[PDB]
Amino acid sequence: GSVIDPSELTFVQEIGSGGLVHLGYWLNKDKVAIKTISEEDFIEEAEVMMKLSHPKLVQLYGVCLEQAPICLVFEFMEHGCLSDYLRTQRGLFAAETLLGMCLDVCEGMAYLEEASVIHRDLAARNCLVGENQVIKVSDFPVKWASPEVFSFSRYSSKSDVWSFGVLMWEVFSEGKIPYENRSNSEVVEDISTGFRLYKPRLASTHVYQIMNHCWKERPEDRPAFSRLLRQLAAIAASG
Ligand SMILES: CCN(CC)CCNC(=O)c1c(C)[nH]c(/C=C2\C(=O)Nc3ccc(F)cc32)c1C
Numbered sequence: 107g108s109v110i111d112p113s114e115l116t117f118v119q120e121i122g123s124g125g126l127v128h129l130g131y132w133l134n135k136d137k138v139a140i141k142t143i144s145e146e147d148f149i150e151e152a153e154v155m156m157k158l159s160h161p162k163l164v165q166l167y168g169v170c171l172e173q174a175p176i177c178l179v180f181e182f183m184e185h186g187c188l189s190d191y192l193r194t195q196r197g198l199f200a201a202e203t204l205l206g207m208c209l210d211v212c213e214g215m216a217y218l219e220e221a222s223v224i225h226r227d228l229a230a231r232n233c234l235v236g237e238n239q240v241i242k243v244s245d246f247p248v249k250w251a252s253p254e255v256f257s258f259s260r261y262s263s264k265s266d267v268w269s270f271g272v273l274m275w276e277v278f279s280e281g282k283i284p285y286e287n288r289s290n291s292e293v294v295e296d297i298s299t300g301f302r303l304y305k306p307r308l309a310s311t312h313v314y315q316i317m318n319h320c321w322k323e324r325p326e327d328r329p330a331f332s333r334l335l336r337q338l339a340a341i342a343a344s345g
Pocket residue numbers: 121122127138139141164180181182183184185186187190234244245
């Protein structure tokens with residue numbers, strides 16, 4: 107990828123918290139989101155992302171290495187984080203649009219799955235909303251963790267699929283907090299007993315069926331993103 111000189115970056119306003127995210131411009135031209143900061147792990151993260159090209163995965167302009175704190179320079183996504191966007195635009199969403207959002211994410215995730223990339227932190231807060239409400243996965247939390255993850259630390263694309271199910275719930279609930287007021291231990295025990303998040307009003311029976319398939323106890327009973335994508339698309343086509 108391209109190396110970016112600090113002089114080429116204009117930091118306009120802080121927009122995110124964690125490192126930090128700033129609204130800015132590169133070369134007095136492109137609107138960018140600048141993410142300031144382990145330095146080597148921070149850079150490698152960018153290196154991985156710059157070689158993964160998909161319409162539903164966020165893209166970088168480059169890396170600014172010269173001056174501490176080092177930063178990553180991303181494309182600007184006008185509607186920000188999905189979690190935030192869902193909450194602010196609550197009441198304006200048709201079910202079809204919410205399903206479309208899930209499809210966008212599923213597309214990105216199927217590409218990552220094929221590339222043998224586990225996200226490990228897939229959630230609406232780690233998705234971004236751009237031009238014409240296109241959703242992109244970014245940055246590629248027990249409430250999003252599968253049973254084999256919170257118990258055995260057993261990650262796979264199938265554990266991402268569980269996370270995606272929770273993301274679907276976030277989307278169809280229009281940005282509600284999953285398992286609100288519940289402690290980590292309460293989430294673990296409830297899910298292990300068989301508790302699943304309720305069906306949001308905007309989620310059809312068909313959509314909820316898919317959520318529950320993402321929430322199967324055994325990873326092998328969950329669909330891969332590649333197949334999940336077609337299941338989601340089929341519901342859209344059915345009407
Ligand atoms: C006034 C209302 N505002 C418009 C949505 C809300 C404030 N703005 C916002 O929250 C916001 C906006 C408009 N973009 C981002 C973040 C990113 C972006 O654009 N590309 C990225 C690439 C990588 C990444 F890790 C974050 C971002 C935020 C937090």
